[PDB]
A paper describes a structure:
In the Laverania subgenus of malaria parasites, of which P. falciparum is the only human-infective member, a single Hsp70 chaperone, Hsp70-x, is exported to the host cell. Common to all Laverania parasites is an expanded set of exported proteins for host cell remodeling; thus, it is believed that Hsp70-x ensures the correct folding of these proteins, thereby supporting parasite survival and virulence functions. At least one of these cochaperones, PFA0660w (pf3d7_0113700), was shown to preferentially stimulate PfHsp70-x activity compared with a human Hsp70 (19).
Consistent with previous studies using full-length PFA0660w, the J-domain of this protein (PFA0660wJ) stimulated PfHsp70-x activity by ∼2-fold. We sought to investigate the structural basis of PfHsp70-x and Hsc70 stimulation by parasite cochaperones, focusing particularly on PFA0660w whose expression coincides with large-scale erythrocyte remodeling. To that end, we resolved the crystallographic structure of PFA0660wJ at 1.38 Å resolution and assigned the NMR spectra of PFA0660wJ in a sequence-specific manner. This allowed us to study the physical interaction of PFA0660wJ with PfHsp70-x or Hsc70 at amino acid–level resolution. As anticipated from the chaperone stimulation assays above, both PfHsp70-x and Hsc70 interacted directly with PFA0660wJ, as evidenced by changes in the intensity of [15N]-labeled PFA0660wJ NMR peaks corresponding to specific amino acids upon titration of this protein with unlabeled PfHsp70-x or Hsc70. Furthermore, we noted that PfHsp70-x produced larger changes in NMR peak intensity compared with Hsc70, suggesting that the PfHsp70-x–PFA0660wJ interaction is stronger than that between PFA0660wJ and the human chaperone, which is consistent with the biochemical assays above. To evaluate whether these interactions are compatible with the formation of canonical chaperone-cochaperone complexes, we mapped the PFA0660wJ amino acids showing the largest changes in NMR assays upon complex formation to the cochaperone domain structure; these amino acids are expected to define the direct protein binding interface. Both the PfHsp70-x and Hsc70 interactions primarily involved residues of the PFA0660wJ α-helix 2 (α2) forming a continuous binding surface toward the C terminus of that helix. Notably, these residues included PFA0660w H110, which is part of a conserved HPD motif found in Hsp40 cochaperones that is necessary for stimulation of Hsp70 activity.
Residue numbers in the entry: 1 to 70
């Protein structure tokens, strides 16, 4: 299973959908492929960006979020 999605995004389990979006934008920008494409951090960032997008894709969906919380 995944490392916890909330912790990855730096949010608490009871945060709002807008909190999730703000955290996603901040962290996705940190690891954005357009920043890392010519650096040795390309691989690190690819993995982190992927996991950030996965965390947001689950937690931003009301039903998938409640299922994750079970």
């Amino acid at each position: 299973g995944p490392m916890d999605y909330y912790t990855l995004l730096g949010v608490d389990k009871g945060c709002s959908e807008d909190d999730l979006r703000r955290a996603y934008l901040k962290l996705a920008m940190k690891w954005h492929p357009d920043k890392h494409v010519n650096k040795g951090s390309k691989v690190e960032a690819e993995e982190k960006f992927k996991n950030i997008c996965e965390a947001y894709s689950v937690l931003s969906d009301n039903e998938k979020r409640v299922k994750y919380d079970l």
